[PDB]
Scaffold this motif. Sequence first.
Motif, PDB file in Angstrom:
ATOM      1  N   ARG A  88       3.783  -2.551  -8.522  1.00 50.07           N
ATOM      2  CA  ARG A  88       3.280  -3.715  -7.541  1.00 50.07           C
ATOM      3  C   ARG A  88       4.290  -4.447  -7.047  1.00 50.07           C
ATOM      4  N   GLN A  89       5.400  -4.962  -7.475  1.00 48.19           N
ATOM      5  CA  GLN A  89       6.495  -5.240  -6.948  1.00 48.19           C
ATOM      6  C   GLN A  89       7.124  -4.533  -5.709  1.00 48.19           C
ATOM      7  N   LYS A  90       7.287  -3.060  -5.847  1.00 49.39           N
ATOM      8  CA  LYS A  90       7.783  -2.251  -4.664  1.00 49.39           C
ATOM      9  C   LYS A  90       6.639  -2.254  -3.556  1.00 49.39           C
ATOM     10  N   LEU A  91       5.383  -2.078  -3.690  1.00 48.88           N
ATOM     11  CA  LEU A  91       4.416  -2.196  -2.716  1.00 48.88           C
ATOM     12  C   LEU A  91       4.247  -3.474  -1.954  1.00 48.88           C
ATOM     13  N   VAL A  92       4.394  -4.428  -2.633  1.00 46.24           N
ATOM     14  CA  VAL A  92       4.242  -5.856  -1.989  1.00 46.24           C
ATOM     15  C   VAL A  92       5.403  -6.040  -1.229  1.00 46.24           C
ATOM     16  N   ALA A  93       6.531  -5.650  -1.598  1.00 43.59           N
ATOM     17  CA  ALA A  93       7.558  -5.819  -0.572  1.00 43.59           C
ATOM     18  C   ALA A  93       7.486  -4.961   0.754  1.00 43.59           C
ATOM     19  N   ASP A  94       6.797  -3.452   0.501  1.00 44.04           N
ATOM     20  CA  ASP A  94       6.389  -2.636   1.425  1.00 44.04           C
ATOM     21  C   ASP A  94       5.447  -3.209   2.437  1.00 44.04           C
ATOM     22  N   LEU A  95       4.076  -3.715   1.747  1.00 50.09           N
ATOM     23  CA  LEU A  95       3.131  -4.087   2.506  1.00 50.09           C
ATOM     24  C   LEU A  95       3.439  -5.310   3.380  1.00 50.09           C
ATOM     25  N   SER A  96       4.445  -6.144   2.810  1.00 53.24           N
ATOM     26  CA  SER A  96       5.042  -7.361   3.508  1.00 53.24           C
ATOM     27  C   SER A  96       5.477  -6.923   5.094  1.00 53.24           C
ATOM     28  N   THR A  97       6.138  -5.734   5.206  1.00 52.13           N
ATOM     29  CA  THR A  97       6.588  -5.190   6.429  1.00 52.13           C
ATOM     30  C   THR A  97       5.450  -4.482   7.314  1.00 52.13           C
TER      31      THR A  97
END
Length: 630
Positions: free
Chosen positions: A40-49
């Motif tokens: 989740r942490q990684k994907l939230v960071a990615d989706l934020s971009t």
Amino acid sequence: LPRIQDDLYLAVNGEWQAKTPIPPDKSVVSADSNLTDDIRQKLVADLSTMTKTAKTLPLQYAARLFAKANDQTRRQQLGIEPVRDRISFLMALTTLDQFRSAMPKLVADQYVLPISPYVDADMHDAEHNILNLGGPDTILPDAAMYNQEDAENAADLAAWSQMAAAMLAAVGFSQTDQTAYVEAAKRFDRRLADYVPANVDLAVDSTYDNPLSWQAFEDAAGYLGIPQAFATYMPQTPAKVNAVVPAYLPHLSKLLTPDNYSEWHAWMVINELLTCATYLSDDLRQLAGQYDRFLAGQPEASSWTKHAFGIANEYFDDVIGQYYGQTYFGADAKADVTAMVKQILAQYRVQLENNTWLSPATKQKAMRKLATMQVKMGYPARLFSLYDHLSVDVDDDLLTAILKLSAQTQAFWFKQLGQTVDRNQWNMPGHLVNASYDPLKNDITFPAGILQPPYYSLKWTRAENLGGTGATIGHEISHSFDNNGALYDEYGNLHNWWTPADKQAFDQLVKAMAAQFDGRDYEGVKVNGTLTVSENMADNAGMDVALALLGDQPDVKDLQAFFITYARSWATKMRPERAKTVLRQDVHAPATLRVNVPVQNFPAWYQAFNVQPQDGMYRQPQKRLTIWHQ
Ligand code: NA
Ligand SMILES: [Zn+2]
């Protein structure tokens, strides 16, 4: 800390188990939940971009939905306002005839209704989709609870009542109307419970095989205008539909009459609010999870990020999971897990061949299931065509966006009824820390999410991977021949492919497996061995075939690595209250028993750690239970 010969689970996980607090915003902490958090942490960071531009359009939509869900400021500023016109609409439906007359709008505008549609394969014709007709769940966590009037039921109803009254207060209901509505709603819930299967019965597939003609649906529900509304979304009306449970739909015309309409109406209003509240302010989404938190003993709501990511996943999980796999799941890991699955299936064939109790006819059809079995590995190459029909617009608020997705989803599925099952639909997204077997497709799915530590690593030994992931692979294959799976053929159709004597022998193993777990303790709670039989069968036969890949004369150090890695992969610490609820509904046994119970059936366990009759992890030979490998 116990010796590994006395308690495998605590010898491996006992240090972690004793020191690890359960965070106030969780009901369980485990290997899988901690990995899920990392993902989740990684994907939230990615989706934020990815709002402005993204790799594809569905991924842009996913990013947009996450941005809406994650906008704490906007969601706070809007409050309950976004729901108010929906509640005014339901509140003007004061009679059953007005409800019926509004049914086209209610169906169009995604309201809570006494029947909801889901489309999937027909169990008697798995090549084609059928319309399933679901209904409401009960407030108590098992419909069987209503059979006994007691203090726990009263406490649970009081917790729910407290939530519901506060949700109605949020939208401006008086103390008097709060009370009236909550009481009226419980009255519908109590009558509903008489026609909802007990949880144990929900653990058997035949409970869901309730076909009826379209005419019979009209006979059961046309007085509400529901079948007619649904039919407007289809090119043709189907000849046959399926009731999700046996007794609800037939009794709907008793449950919902002009005289008791007001009880349904109260329930509908409370549930519409509760449902939409998930998409409103942080306070309101928190309020809407109060009862489930009470059942879990969870002191606090989930974090904001966990909540917002959860929302994005309601509609875009496959898209997100496809991105996860393409980005973070390597080609060499994929090739190594693919080879492992091919090896486990090959060994499962050897085990059926060597099996000494199945007669020739039955053994051949078991082999057929391994012959047609398909593998969904990591993430889909091609997104399911639903994603050509979901969209998220830039300016929409969260509730508007969610309502649209719900409408787009419902419309798409109503168009799939005249059509063949699309084998390209996956039942799990690529980032999920889980795995599955689908009897209707006869396939096994291994999302990229589960193919990493603590379950798998390219850098781990084969024995470690077999223990961490092999037993899982085996488990999923074993679901084709569990007490549910064994009822379907290699084409996904319910068909009796057993001889009488082989079916009798099988039934006895299932019975022994229920007995092997029934009544064991977890966190002070009794495990139901019947409820959990399907999963305990899969665990047992899954561990068996994974152990066989270690070869005929394994080194003790590999036998040890297998069991240690398996045990660690199951580290789970949950609230006693959550256990109480889970152990009444979940087909899985708790993690401690999924570790300590099965191993004691296998000679490799005794060889691994030189386990003796005086040791805690010793089972008397005549109580040891194996399935195909005997
Ligand atoms: Na699980
Ligand atoms: Zn399972």
